Design a protein around this nucleic acid. Structure first.
Lengths: 41, 200, 25, 51, 97, 198, 127
RNA sequence: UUUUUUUU
RNA sequence: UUUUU
RNA sequence: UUUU
RNA sequence: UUUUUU
RNA sequence: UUUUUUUUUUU
């Protein structure tokens, strides 16, 4: 397996970014699907 | 094999057998080894590319400071070079234009304005970051996107004891028409810290 | 995406810094 | 459960083999059998003390 | 060993302990913050005074309260006390002799 | 074809190893843990006390023989115990809130989990001294760095064969301390390659 | 085995493990025929003498001087304000991966190397 | 059992 | 820059 | 400077 | 502000 | 990433 090369600081920051980013993506997807059925389906 | 080593003059016959030339850096040879060389334009024309490539490509004959003339391509939309204009050239080969083995540099050159329309390539088009674009990168506030899942969870374990913002504890989240408040500690944390710090 | 930005906090609500409670040897 | 209690804790499949203990009973029996088969070269060696 | 056996007994006992404290403590908080509880729905009256959050949190904290017995084998200077008092006995006798 | 009932043969070397298609198969392995942490915490206090009480009667080597602990392992128990107690008595900070690298934090979790499943060890199980045994310790063990050869070839004959050339020790420079003062530290440079000692 | 014997002899003389001291045995000697063994035995004796008699108690120089100039420092609660930190864990935030092997060698290795042999720091002197 | 899992 | 919620 |  | 938990 | 060490293959 290839070894890591990125700075630790960046690596650690990536995990922090995902804490609030990830949840938003899940809600954004269901927002369109749920709303479509409540007005058309 | 060792057949080529025979003879008392092996130290003068073998070494004189050059394999080949230097394929790399074979086109850009008039620069005298300099990274870049300034020049002046004395002819502007439009050379038609070879087949099957159609269209028209703008070119100009730029006279190098070393008393040598060579065609140079002017990539990018628009055109501002005219007769007796100073432009800085660089390395680069053009397949469509035969013979041309040089490229011009925008910005650093003389009497060469910035590109007309370009946002993706900045350095290439020697385009500086505009004030309007810089201000857009700082606006980050799109977190309030609650859904039905949050509504049910809020009114199951977070509705009995919950402190609001202004002055009140007990709110009305059960009402459908009402909107669940936001977090006063976590929501919009990055934007709040930056805005409150520059205010000094 | 139906909700945009109506209620925003810029300077009205401050942020409490993290207290210090981890002694370093 | 109404009463707060740690009844939801469960062990992992790989946890059992991650912390083994060399005290289980079903190894001594196998070891004893292998001992006899390992010392057979000298058991049936009808030679002198030197050999 | 004893504690383990009596796990169920202990935990069940502590359930009523927290009820008398959470209910009284929450009553004062609403009075200072809120105005009155006369116009509130009767259904929500019980939940507000004894929320599921404080009840579970207080019970866990109070359950552990009962614990921490036999403070003799305490890491921060709890074991050394016995040894210090044991060995020293013999030293005085020897000295005299 | 040949008879050799022993446990140091070519095929028997590195027993219980994947030789074939099983190399790519995932397999779980036990997690290692230092001996100085698997011992009962209770006994650590006791051991420390003795050491600090009478170093003469309770020497570093004698103390470790009764409980079956190595000379190096027993040293860490006193050192790690001392610091833990110092911060508690002085009311400086709690052990849990102590700052330490991530390598130690994961180690602490394993120590707690080790006892929760099996339990703490009342007495250490390790030999004070080493023993010359045939074992696989890395890739640098089964190699000759002097002659730089893997396969030894010798003549087959009943008569005494001439011996091989013995190697010589490598001479390297070292340093020693002669005079030590609070404001100065004098040292001497030794050169074993110098013929004249003087 | 040598250390066991030597260490045992001393205790007998002093009668440490005795509530009622009965000084009867006041002469212990060891006799060995083997020259090699004899020499070795002597070594053990030396170690025994250490950490027992106050006249032969060694101490490293770095810690000996520190122990002499002792002081009582009073630290209040407000003096430990900067000692505490926010982050719980710690680790290296910059990989030690070298970028330029030659440029770094001729800038921070050659100037700091004045010897042709690799020598480590010698041990401290015992006083 | 420590403001532990938990993250400017 | 500010700092035991 | 979470050692100027 | 919630959930879990030798 | 070592309390009393300026020593430590710390990991």
């Amino acid at each position: 397996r290839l070894q890591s090369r990125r700075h630790p600081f960046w690596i650690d920051m990536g995990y922090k970014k995902r804490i609030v980013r990830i949840p938003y993506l899940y809600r954004r997807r269901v927002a369109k699907e749920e709303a479509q059925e409540r007005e058309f389906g | 094999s060792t057949r080529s080593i025979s003879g008392r003059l092996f130290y003068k016959r073998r070494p004189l057998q050059v394999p080949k030339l230097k394929p790399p850096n074979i086109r850009s040879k008039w620069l005298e080894g300099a990274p870049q060389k300034k020049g002046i334009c004395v002819k502007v024309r439009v050379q038609t590319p070879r087949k099957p490539n159609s269209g028209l490509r703008k070119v100009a004959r730029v006279r190098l400071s070393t008393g040598r003339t060579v065609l140079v391509y002017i990539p990018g939309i628009g055109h501002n070079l005219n007769v007796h204009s100073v432009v800085l050239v660089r390395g680069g080969r053009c397949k469509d234009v035969p013979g041309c083995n040089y490229k011009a540099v925008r910005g650093v050159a003389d009497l060469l304005p910035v590109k007309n329309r370009e946002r993706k390539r900045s350095k290439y088009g020697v385009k500086l970051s505009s004030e309007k674009k810089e201000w857009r990168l700082q606006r980050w506030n799109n977190k309030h996107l609650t859904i039905e899942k949050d509504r049910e969870l809020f009114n199951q374990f977070r509705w009995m004891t919950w402190r609001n913002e202004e002055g009140e504890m007990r709110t009305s989240p059960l009402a459908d028409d009402e909107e669940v408040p936001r977090h006063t500690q976590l929501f919009n944390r990055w934007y709040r810290l930056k805005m409150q710090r520059e205010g000094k | 995406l139906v909700l945009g930005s109506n209620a925003k906090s810029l300077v009205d609500i401050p942020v409490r810094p993290k207290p210090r409670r981890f002694f370093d040897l | 459960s109404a009463l707060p209690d740690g009844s939801t804790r469960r062990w992992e499949n790989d946890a059992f083999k991650a912390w083994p203990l060399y005290g289980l009973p079903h190894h001594v029996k196998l070891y004893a059998v292998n001992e006899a088969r390992y010392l057979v070269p000298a058991a049936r060696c009808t030679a002198g003390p030197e050999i | 060993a004893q504690w383990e056996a009596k796990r169920g007994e202990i935990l069940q006992y502590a359930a009523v302990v927290a009820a008398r404290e959470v209910r009284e403590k929450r009553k004062k908080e609403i009075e200072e913050a809120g105005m009155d509880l006369a116009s509130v729905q009767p259904e929500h009256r019980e939940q507000m005074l004894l929320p599921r959050s404080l009840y579970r949190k207080q019970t866990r904290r109070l359950f552990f309260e009962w614990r921490r017995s036999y403070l003799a084998p305490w890491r921060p200077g709890g074991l050394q006390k016995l040894m210090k008092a044991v060995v020293t006995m013999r030293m005085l006798q020897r000295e005299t002799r | 074809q040949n008879r050799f009932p022993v446990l140091n043969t070519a095929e028997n070397f590195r027993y219980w190893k994947d030789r074939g298609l099983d190399r790519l198969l995932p397999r779980v392995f036990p997690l290692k843990l230092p001996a100085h942490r698997r011992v009962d915490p209770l006994l650590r206090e006791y051991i420390f006390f003795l050491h600090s009480m009478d170093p003469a009667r309770f020497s570093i080597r004698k103390l470790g023989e009764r409980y079956g602990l190595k000379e190096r392992t027993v040293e860490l128990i006193c050192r790690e115990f001392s610091v833990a107690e110092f911060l508690r008595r002085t009311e400086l900070a709690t052990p849990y809130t102590r700052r330490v690298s991530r390598e130690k934090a994961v180690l602490r979790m394993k120590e707690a989990l080790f006892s929760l499943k099996l339990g703490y060890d009342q007495l250490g199980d390790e030999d004070l001294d080493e023993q010359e045994e045939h074992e696989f310790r890395g890739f640098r063990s089964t190699q000759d760095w002097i002659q730089r050869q893997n396969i030894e070839v010798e003549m087959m004959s009943a008569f005494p064969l001439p011996a091989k050339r013995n190697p010589l020790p490598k001479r390297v420079d070292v340093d020693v301390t002669v005079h030590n003062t609070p404001k100065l530290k004098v040292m001497n440079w030794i050169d074993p390659n110098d013929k004249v000692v003087f | 085995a040598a250390e066991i014997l030597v260490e045992s002899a001393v205790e007998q003389l002093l009668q440490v493990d005795a509530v009622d001291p009965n000084y009867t045995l006041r002469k212990i000697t060891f006799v060995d025929r083997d020259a090699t063994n004899a020499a070795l035995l002597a070594e053990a004796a030396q170690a025994a003498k250490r950490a027992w008699l106050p006249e032969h108690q060694v101490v490293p120089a770095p810690v000996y001087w520190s122990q002499k100039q002792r002081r009582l420092l009073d630290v209040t609660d407000g003096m430990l304000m900067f000692c505490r930190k926010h982050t719980r864990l710690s680790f290296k935030k910059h990989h030690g991966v070298i970028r330029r092997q030659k440029t770094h060698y001729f800038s921070n290795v050659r100037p700091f190397l004045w010897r042709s042999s690799r020598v480590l720091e010698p041990p401290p002197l015992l006083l």
